[PDB]
Ligand binder design. Structure first.
Ligand SMILES: Nc1nc2c(ncn2[C@@H]2O[C@H](COP(=O)(O)OP(=O)(O)O)[C@@H](O)[C@H]2O)c(=O)[nH]1
Ligand SMILES: [Mg+2]
Length: 237
Protein backbone atom coordinates (compact mmCIF):
# COMPACT_ATOMS: atom_id res chain seq x y z
CA UNK A 1 0.00 0.00 0.00
CA UNK A 2 1.33 3.39 -1.10
CA UNK A 3 2.22 5.51 1.94
CA UNK A 4 2.01 9.31 1.61
CA UNK A 5 2.69 12.03 4.20
CA UNK A 6 1.08 15.46 3.84
CA UNK A 7 3.59 18.14 4.91
CA UNK A 8 3.45 21.92 4.92
CA UNK A 9 2.42 24.92 6.97
CA UNK A 10 -1.08 25.29 8.38
CA UNK A 11 -3.65 26.63 5.92
CA UNK A 12 -1.97 25.64 2.65
CA UNK A 13 -4.30 22.74 1.86
CA UNK A 14 -2.83 19.58 3.37
CA UNK A 15 -6.14 18.22 4.65
CA UNK A 16 -8.12 19.16 1.52
CA UNK A 17 -5.42 17.59 -0.67
CA UNK A 18 -5.62 14.37 1.33
CA UNK A 19 -9.41 14.44 1.03
CA UNK A 20 -9.23 14.85 -2.74
CA UNK A 21 -6.66 12.07 -3.16
CA UNK A 22 -8.81 9.60 -1.20
CA UNK A 23 -12.06 10.97 -2.66
CA UNK A 24 -13.71 11.17 0.76
CA UNK A 25 -14.21 13.82 3.41
CA UNK A 26 -11.92 12.25 6.02
CA UNK A 27 -9.58 15.00 7.26
CA UNK A 28 -10.87 18.08 9.05
CA UNK A 29 -10.75 21.05 6.67
CA UNK A 30 -12.72 23.89 8.24
CA UNK A 31 -13.34 27.07 6.27
CA UNK A 32 -13.32 29.72 9.03
CA UNK A 33 -14.48 28.11 12.28
CA UNK A 34 -12.34 26.70 15.09
CA UNK A 35 -10.57 23.43 14.31
CA UNK A 36 -10.41 20.29 16.45
CA UNK A 37 -7.64 18.13 14.96
CA UNK A 38 -4.45 18.72 16.96
CA UNK A 39 -2.53 15.56 15.95
CA UNK A 40 -1.63 13.36 12.98
CA UNK A 41 -4.47 11.49 11.25
CA UNK A 42 -4.15 8.39 9.04
CA UNK A 43 -6.74 7.25 6.50
CA UNK A 44 -6.54 4.26 4.16
CA UNK A 45 -8.37 4.29 0.87
CA UNK A 46 -8.14 3.69 -2.85
CA UNK A 47 -6.65 6.11 -5.38
CA UNK A 48 -6.73 5.38 -9.13
CA UNK A 49 -7.42 1.74 -8.28
CA UNK A 50 -4.30 1.57 -6.07
CA UNK A 51 -4.51 1.06 -2.32
CA UNK A 52 -3.21 4.16 -0.53
CA UNK A 53 -2.35 5.20 3.03
CA UNK A 54 -2.36 8.96 3.71
CA UNK A 55 -0.95 10.57 6.87
CA UNK A 56 -2.13 14.14 7.52
CA UNK A 57 -0.09 16.34 9.83
CA UNK A 58 -0.77 19.16 12.31
CA UNK A 59 1.44 22.26 12.60
CA UNK A 60 4.68 20.29 12.98
CA UNK A 61 6.36 22.36 10.27
CA UNK A 62 6.13 25.85 11.74
CA UNK A 63 8.00 28.19 14.04
CA UNK A 64 7.46 26.67 17.43
CA UNK A 65 9.06 25.90 20.78
CA UNK A 66 10.55 22.50 21.58
CA UNK A 67 7.82 20.78 23.63
CA UNK A 68 6.46 17.30 24.31
CA UNK A 69 3.58 18.10 21.96
CA UNK A 70 5.95 18.53 19.01
CA UNK A 71 7.67 15.21 19.62
CA UNK A 72 4.36 13.44 20.27
CA UNK A 73 3.23 14.61 16.83
CA UNK A 74 6.46 13.82 15.02
CA UNK A 75 6.26 10.50 16.85
CA UNK A 76 2.75 9.74 15.62
CA UNK A 77 3.93 10.83 12.17
CA UNK A 78 6.53 8.05 11.96
CA UNK A 79 4.28 5.52 13.72
CA UNK A 80 1.52 5.94 11.13
CA UNK A 81 3.85 5.97 8.10
CA UNK A 82 6.17 3.17 9.25
CA UNK A 83 8.34 1.80 7.81
CA UNK A 84 8.49 5.11 5.94
CA UNK A 85 6.85 7.24 3.27
CA UNK A 86 7.13 6.51 -0.43
CA UNK A 87 6.14 10.13 -1.13
CA UNK A 88 6.48 13.31 0.92
CA UNK A 89 3.69 15.50 -0.44
CA UNK A 90 4.84 19.08 0.16
CA UNK A 91 1.79 21.32 -0.23
CA UNK A 92 2.30 24.94 -1.32
CA UNK A 93 -0.65 27.28 -1.79
CA UNK A 94 -0.13 28.59 -5.32
CA UNK A 95 0.44 32.34 -5.32
CA UNK A 96 0.97 32.43 -1.54
CA UNK A 97 4.50 31.24 -0.85
CA UNK A 98 5.83 33.38 1.99
CA UNK A 99 8.42 33.15 4.76
CA UNK A 100 6.41 30.48 6.60
CA UNK A 101 6.51 28.00 3.70
CA UNK A 102 10.28 28.59 3.55
CA UNK A 103 10.35 27.71 7.27
CA UNK A 104 8.23 24.65 6.49
CA UNK A 105 10.80 23.43 3.95
CA UNK A 106 13.52 23.82 6.59
CA UNK A 107 11.57 21.76 9.14
CA UNK A 108 10.65 19.04 6.64
CA UNK A 109 14.42 18.43 6.53
CA UNK A 110 14.71 18.58 10.32
CA UNK A 111 11.86 16.10 10.85
CA UNK A 112 12.87 13.58 8.18
CA UNK A 113 16.61 14.07 7.60
CA UNK A 114 19.00 13.33 4.77
CA UNK A 115 17.45 11.71 1.70
CA UNK A 116 13.91 12.94 2.29
CA UNK A 117 13.99 15.35 -0.67
CA UNK A 118 14.48 12.46 -3.08
CA UNK A 119 10.92 11.46 -2.12
CA UNK A 120 9.26 14.90 -2.11
CA UNK A 121 6.55 15.92 -4.56
CA UNK A 122 5.42 19.55 -4.53
CA UNK A 123 1.65 19.94 -4.73
CA UNK A 124 0.31 23.41 -5.52
CA UNK A 125 -3.17 23.99 -4.15
CA UNK A 126 -5.51 26.68 -5.49
CA UNK A 127 -4.82 25.69 -9.10
CA UNK A 128 -7.84 27.83 -10.00
CA UNK A 129 -6.02 31.00 -8.84
CA UNK A 130 -3.63 30.45 -11.74
CA UNK A 131 -6.06 31.98 -14.25
CA UNK A 132 -5.82 30.35 -17.65
CA UNK A 133 -2.06 30.23 -17.19
CA UNK A 134 -0.10 26.98 -17.35
CA UNK A 135 1.59 25.56 -14.26
CA UNK A 136 4.90 24.98 -16.03
CA UNK A 137 4.76 28.59 -17.21
CA UNK A 138 4.09 29.78 -13.66
CA UNK A 139 6.94 27.87 -11.98
CA UNK A 140 9.48 29.02 -14.55
CA UNK A 141 8.47 32.65 -14.14
CA UNK A 142 7.83 33.33 -10.43
CA UNK A 143 9.90 36.00 -8.67
CA UNK A 144 10.50 33.55 -5.83
CA UNK A 145 14.03 32.16 -5.67
CA UNK A 146 13.21 30.20 -2.52
CA UNK A 147 10.56 28.38 -4.58
CA UNK A 148 12.89 27.74 -7.53
CA UNK A 149 15.49 26.04 -5.33
CA UNK A 150 12.73 23.76 -4.05
CA UNK A 151 11.72 22.81 -7.61
CA UNK A 152 15.32 22.00 -8.58
CA UNK A 153 15.91 19.99 -5.39
CA UNK A 154 12.68 18.05 -6.04
CA UNK A 155 13.89 17.33 -9.61
CA UNK A 156 10.92 19.24 -11.07
CA UNK A 157 8.36 16.90 -9.47
CA UNK A 158 5.27 19.03 -8.88
CA UNK A 159 1.51 19.14 -9.48
CA UNK A 160 -1.53 21.33 -8.82
CA UNK A 161 -4.97 20.74 -7.28
CA UNK A 162 -8.30 22.50 -7.25
CA UNK A 163 -9.53 20.84 -4.08
CA UNK A 164 -12.92 22.54 -4.55
CA UNK A 165 -12.92 21.23 -8.11
CA UNK A 166 -15.65 19.49 -10.06
CA UNK A 167 -15.80 15.73 -10.65
CA UNK A 168 -14.14 16.01 -14.07
CA UNK A 169 -11.60 18.54 -12.79
CA UNK A 170 -10.77 16.30 -9.81
CA UNK A 171 -10.39 13.16 -11.96
CA UNK A 172 -7.98 15.01 -14.26
CA UNK A 173 -5.69 16.37 -11.53
CA UNK A 174 -5.44 12.95 -9.87
CA UNK A 175 -4.16 11.37 -13.09
CA UNK A 176 -1.52 14.10 -13.44
CA UNK A 177 -0.43 13.43 -9.85
CA UNK A 178 -0.21 9.69 -10.56
CA UNK A 179 2.10 10.46 -13.49
CA UNK A 180 4.50 12.26 -11.16
CA UNK A 181 4.31 9.48 -8.56
CA UNK A 182 4.73 6.79 -11.23
CA UNK A 183 7.90 8.52 -12.47
CA UNK A 184 9.07 8.93 -8.88
CA UNK A 185 8.39 5.29 -8.03
CA UNK A 186 10.48 4.10 -10.97
CA UNK A 187 13.34 6.50 -10.16
CA UNK A 188 13.27 5.12 -6.61
CA UNK A 189 12.55 1.53 -7.75
CA UNK A 190 9.80 1.25 -5.14
CA UNK A 191 11.91 2.65 -2.31
CA UNK A 192 10.44 4.43 0.70
CA UNK A 193 12.27 7.03 2.77
CA UNK A 194 13.57 5.74 6.08
CA UNK A 195 15.94 6.37 8.97
CA UNK A 196 16.60 4.86 12.40
CA UNK A 197 13.51 6.44 13.92
CA UNK A 198 11.29 5.02 11.17
CA UNK A 199 12.97 1.66 11.76
CA UNK A 200 12.55 2.03 15.52
CA UNK A 201 8.85 2.79 14.99
CA UNK A 202 8.37 -0.15 12.60
CA UNK A 203 9.82 -2.64 15.10
CA UNK A 204 7.67 -1.12 17.86
CA UNK A 205 4.31 -1.73 16.14
CA UNK A 206 4.99 -5.09 14.46
CA UNK A 207 3.24 -7.90 16.31
CA UNK A 208 5.52 -10.54 17.76
CA UNK A 209 7.89 -8.09 19.44
CA UNK A 210 6.86 -9.54 22.78
CA UNK A 211 9.03 -7.45 25.07
CA UNK A 212 7.46 -4.02 25.51
CA UNK A 213 10.93 -2.74 26.31
CA UNK A 214 10.14 0.69 24.87
CA UNK A 215 7.52 3.14 26.13
CA UNK A 216 5.56 6.16 24.95
CA UNK A 217 7.89 8.41 26.95
CA UNK A 218 10.96 6.48 25.75
CA UNK A 219 9.75 6.54 22.13
CA UNK A 220 9.00 10.27 22.21
CA UNK A 221 12.45 10.68 23.78
CA UNK A 222 14.02 8.76 20.89
CA UNK A 223 12.05 11.05 18.57
CA UNK A 224 13.68 14.15 20.07
CA UNK A 225 17.16 12.64 19.96
CA UNK A 226 16.65 11.80 16.27
CA UNK A 227 15.52 15.31 15.26
CA UNK A 228 18.53 16.85 17.01
CA UNK A 229 20.71 14.51 14.94
CA UNK A 230 19.01 15.93 11.84
CA UNK A 231 19.65 19.44 13.21
CA UNK A 232 23.35 18.75 13.85
CA UNK A 233 23.95 17.17 10.45
CA UNK A 234 22.12 20.10 8.84
CA UNK A 235 24.05 22.76 10.77
CA UNK A 236 27.08 21.09 9.12
CA UNK A 237 27.12 22.82 5.74
N1 LIG B 1 -10.32 27.28 -3.40
C1 LIG B 1 -9.53 26.35 -2.82
N2 LIG B 1 -9.54 26.23 -1.47
C2 LIG B 1 -8.76 25.32 -0.85
C3 LIG B 1 -7.90 24.44 -1.65
N3 LIG B 1 -7.25 23.64 -0.79
C4 LIG B 1 -7.66 23.97 0.46
N4 LIG B 1 -8.57 24.96 0.42
C5 LIG B 1 -9.24 25.59 1.57
O1 LIG B 1 -8.25 26.16 2.43
C6 LIG B 1 -8.64 26.00 3.79
C7 LIG B 1 -7.47 25.42 4.56
O2 LIG B 1 -7.14 24.18 3.95
P1 LIG B 1 -6.67 22.92 4.82
O3 LIG B 1 -6.84 21.65 4.04
O4 LIG B 1 -7.42 22.84 6.13
O5 LIG B 1 -5.12 23.29 5.04
P2 LIG B 1 -4.25 22.66 6.23
O6 LIG B 1 -4.21 23.65 7.37
O7 LIG B 1 -2.85 22.42 5.73
O8 LIG B 1 -4.86 21.36 6.71
C8 LIG B 1 -9.80 25.02 3.82
O9 LIG B 1 -10.99 25.66 4.27
C9 LIG B 1 -9.97 24.55 2.40
O10 LIG B 1 -11.36 24.51 2.07
C10 LIG B 1 -7.94 24.63 -3.12
O11 LIG B 1 -7.23 23.93 -3.87
N5 LIG B 1 -8.75 25.58 -3.61
MG1 LIG C 1 -5.55 20.30 8.25
Amino acid sequence: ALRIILVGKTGCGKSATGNSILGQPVFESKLRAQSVTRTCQVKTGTWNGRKVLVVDTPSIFESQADTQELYKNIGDCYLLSAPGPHVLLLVIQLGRFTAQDTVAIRKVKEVFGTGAMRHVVILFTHKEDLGGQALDDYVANTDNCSLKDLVRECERRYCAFNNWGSVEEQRQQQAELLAVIERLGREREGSFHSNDLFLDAQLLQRTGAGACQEDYRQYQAKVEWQVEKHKQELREN
